[PDB]
Amino acid sequence: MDLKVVVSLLYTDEIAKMQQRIGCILPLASTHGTQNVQGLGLGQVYSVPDYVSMYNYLSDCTLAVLDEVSVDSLILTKIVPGQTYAIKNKYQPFFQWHGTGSLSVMPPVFGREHATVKLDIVFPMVLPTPIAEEVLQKILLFNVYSRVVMQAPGNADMLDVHMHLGSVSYLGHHYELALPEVPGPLGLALLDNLSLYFCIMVTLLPRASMRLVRGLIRHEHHDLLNLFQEMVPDEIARIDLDDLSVADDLSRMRVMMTYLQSLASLFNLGPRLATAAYSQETLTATCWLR
Amino acid sequence: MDLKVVVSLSSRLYTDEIAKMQQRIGCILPLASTHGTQNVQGLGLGQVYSLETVPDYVSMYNYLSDCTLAVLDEVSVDSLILTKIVPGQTYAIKNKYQPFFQWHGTGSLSVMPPVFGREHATVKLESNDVDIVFPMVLPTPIAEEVLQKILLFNVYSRVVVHMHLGSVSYLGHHYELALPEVPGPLGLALLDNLSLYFCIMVTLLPRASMRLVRGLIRHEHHDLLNLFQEMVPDEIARIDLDDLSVADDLSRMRVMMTYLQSLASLFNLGPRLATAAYSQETLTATCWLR
Amino acid sequence: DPARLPRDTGPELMWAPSLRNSLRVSPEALELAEREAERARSERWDRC
User: Fold this and answer.
1) How far is CA B212 from the centre of its chain?
2) Where in the cell is it found (chain C)?
3) Where are the beta strands (DSSP E) in C1-48?
4) At A250, which helix (H) or strand (E)?
5) Is C6 in CB contact (< 8 Å) with chain A?
């Protein structure tokens, strides 16, 4: 079918800055012919930063590679799950790609100033899946460990969480990170709410697991495994309460199930883009929607 | 490609069923086979959800996911034309579901066994002496809310509050849903796999985040925290005695994030529909099968 | 730390419960044999 999208709006250094990234992708607002500036990628959501809303917005709208930049227009083609494309790793945090590696799109956690073009347009980061999940874990534990040493200095140390969190590793590629060393408490940082979801679900997991095992074990034997895996947890989490207000317990269970499912849909990185044959000499890769 | 399936009725049709079924045009219906012509048996979930008193929702989910999907547009006497749904094709899906669910913009639809009573989405076809039920289609957040409400009813069967669990709430309207008492060993098997995942979570759950959340509830109060009623849980007292170490926290998260993807994908039961461009004036949307 | 289970049948990997991996014990016959052999032992106590 017809795949082009012509959006209307620049000057010479803007031409060079947009020409630097003529192989990258960004989301749109709608799959129509003509659009405005505001319907382009990550502009209306990222300017307080918050990760989960941006991942929801990235899974919300479709995606598009851009092709050419004129003086007053940006010729760009949206991606459809039918046929394949050719995109580029032209992002300033350079994660080297590999053959038949699935590519992800996460909202930019590496600061505004790296993946941007100041006119606004905010490009999302493209990087492979094990690097994606490992940088998710190593930014989340960095968040909670920064909040703990902002609360209690005797629980952890700052260099104790930079010998193991400032670097990601994938097939020998030992990259570094731009970690925000001064987040500031009471929220107000990026990934401030995802840690705030993770802690609540890891707090309500004992009240969930014990209630589930005690409710499942009375139905005598559909399976042995619910009592077979009663030995693998510690007995500290076994003998916790066995009694609470079932109004309060049910409300806690419903909130933990909702936050668990939203968190588990977010830990799945989102729009998974699959490669076929990467060529580092050309910085291009065959890719299609999955 | 030509995707038309005509279903031949084995007898005639009275005028009241004609008037009822012509109201039910555009809804999603399931099919037995994917062949050219079929008879009235094997259509609908009524073969596995019979005219009985004890439902079984998870076997209905299995019958929905196993079989193919179609949409009913042209219905007359002795004959009614269906249009199949196959991956790779796009369709228009109209919103003719009498619990009137307002659809979000460009979200994702989900099919559903009829939770709002058997008699709500059912055409009695006494002429061919059988029954066709219509599977509900409603958006994914309401889908997960209904599903986790179903499983929480199944696990709080053995405890007791009832009206605050077996009744969903939406921006459009709050609804009630039919509740059985036992879903059989398949619902117990879903609870089995859920408790398996949950007990291995509480084996491998990290301990930096609990040490965060203790000082965080004692420091801050949020909507994400007021469900604890400003009370620390007991396992927070008998767990945070240990020291805080980075390496085993990373090794815990490196398996936690692996397991949560499986825990999300276990709630993928029932076919999902990632639609696009829903309009609130046409009551239809461009959809395709994910 | 053991586990408890009703039944299964016919494995190939060894540490899996079965119907052949069950020891075949009759309690009443073993108690009867044990008691009568205790009395034979008690007669053997008083011989030399």
Assistant:
1) 35
2) Virion; Host nucleus
3) none
4) helix A246-267
5) yes
